[PDB]
From Swiss-Prot:
Keywords: Acetylation, Cell membrane, Cytoplasm, Disease variant, Lyase, Membrane, Metal-binding, Osteopetrosis, Phosphoprotein, Zinc. Changing T195 to S/V: Reduced activity. It comes from Homo sapiens. It is linked to Osteopetrosis, autosomal recessive 3: A rare genetic disease characterized by abnormally dense bone, due to defective resorption of immature bone. Osteopetrosis occurs in two forms: a severe autosomal recessive form occurring in utero, infancy, or childhood, and a benign autosomal dominant form occurring in adolescence or adulthood. Recessive osteopetrosis commonly manifests in early infancy with macrocephaly, feeding difficulties, evolving blindness and deafness, bone marrow failure, severe anemia, and hepatosplenomegaly. The record marks Q89 as: Involved in the binding of some activators, including histamine and L-histidine. This is Carbonic anhydrase 2. The gene is CA2. The lineage of its organism: Eukaryota, Metazoa, Chordata, Craniata, Vertebrata.
Length: 257
C-alpha cells in the first residue's frame, strides 16, 4: 500500500490514485514574486476558543490530533472562504533533517516541518460528503523552523512515546490549538488537494507566511515515531512529505502587500 519509501512513495501513487497527475494537486512551490496581493481577500477568522480535542492517533503515515466536530466549536471562516469550516484534526509532515520536511515551499525553500489544520465545509454536513466537493475542505498550513521551543507544542511532543507505532492511539483531551499559531495571520491561498492518497481535489489551501519556531529537541521527538506497527521491523517516521507539484492553471494569491 502507499507510503513514503522507494517502492511505495509519491512517484508511485498515480498508479492507484490517477488524480496524482490532476489539475489541482498539492503541495506547490509559492513563488513570492508571482503571487499577487488580492485586496478582495478578507481577514482570516480562526475561532478556536471552544475547540475540544479528543485523541491522538499514529495512522502509519503521521499522527493525527482529533477534535469533536459534532457541533460548531472550532471554526475557520473569512479569508478566501465562503461559509464556515469546522476543525476536525491537525497533523504534521516533517523531515529526517532540519533542511527538509515541509510540503509547500516558499521560493523553493523547504522548512523543517509543516502543520496542517484540517477543516470541512459545514454546508456538506459531514467530512465524508465534504471530500466529494471542490470546496469541501479548508486547510491552514503553518511552517515550522528549528530555533526556540514552541511551548504550546510540548504537550504533543510528550505524548508521542505512547503512540510510537501504527494503530496506537491515546487520550488527548483539553489541548488548545491556539498555542500552535504564529503572531501574524498573513497568508497565501490557492485551490489544491490532499497531499496524501487519495489525493482528492477538495481543498482551499491557506498557507501562513510567518513560520513558528520549534526546538531541535521537539522535532527530534517527531522523528522517533515509527511508520510500522508494533512487533514489525522499525522504520522511523521521517520524510512523510510530498514534493511540490505542477502549478498548472492556478494563481496563488497573497492576503498582504
Ligand atoms: O496530509 N493529509 C492527510 C489527509 C488529509 C489531508 C487534508 F487535510 F488535505 F484533508 C492532509 S493535508
Ligand atoms: Zn497534511
Amino acid at each position: 500500500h502507499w507510503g513514503y519509501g522507494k517502492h511505495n512513495g509519491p512517484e508511485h501513487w498515480h498508479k492507484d490514485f490517477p488524480i496524482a497527475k490532476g489539475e489541482r494537486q498539492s503541495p506547490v512551490d509559492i513563488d513570492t514574486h508571482t503571487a499577487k496581493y488580492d485586496p478582495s481577500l478578507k481577514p482570516l477568522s480562526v475561532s478556536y476558543d471552544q475547540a475540544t480535542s479528543l485523541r491522538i492517533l499514529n495512522n502509519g503515515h503521521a499522527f493525527n490530533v482529533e477534535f469533536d466536530d459534532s457541533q460548531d466549536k472550532a471554526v475557520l471562516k473569512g479569508g478566501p472562504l465562503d461559509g464556515t469550516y469546522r476543525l476536525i484534526q491537525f497533523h504534521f509532515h516533517w523531515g529526517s533533517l532540519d533542511g527538509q520536511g515541509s510540503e509547500h515551499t516558499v521560493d523553493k525553500k523547504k522548512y523543517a516541518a509543516e502543520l496542517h489544520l484540517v477543516h470541512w465545509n459545514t454546508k456538506y454536513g459531514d467530512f465524508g460528503k465534504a471530500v466529494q466537493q471542490p470546496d469541501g475542505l479548508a486547510v491552514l498550513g503553518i511552517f515550522l523552523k528549528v530555533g526556540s521551543a514552541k511551548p504550546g507544542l510540548q504537550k504533543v511532543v510528550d505524548v508521542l512515546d505512547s503512540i510510537k507505532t501504527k494503530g496506537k492511539s491515546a487520550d488527548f483531551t483539553n489541548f488548545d490549538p491556539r498555542g500552535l499559531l504564529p503572531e501574524s495571520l498573513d497568508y497565501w491561498t490557492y485551490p489544491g488537494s490532499l497531499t496524501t492518497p487519495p489525493l482528492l481535489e477538495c481543498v482551499t489551501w491557506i498557507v501562513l507566511k510567518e513560520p513558528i519556531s520549534v526546538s531541535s529537541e521537539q522535532v527530534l521527538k517527531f522523528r522517533k515515531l515509527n511508520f510500522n506497527g508494533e512487533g514489525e521491523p522499525e522504520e522511523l517516521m521521517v520524510d512523510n512529505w510530498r514534493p511540490a507539484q505542477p502549478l498548472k492553471n492556478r494563481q496563488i494569491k497573497a492576503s498582504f502587500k
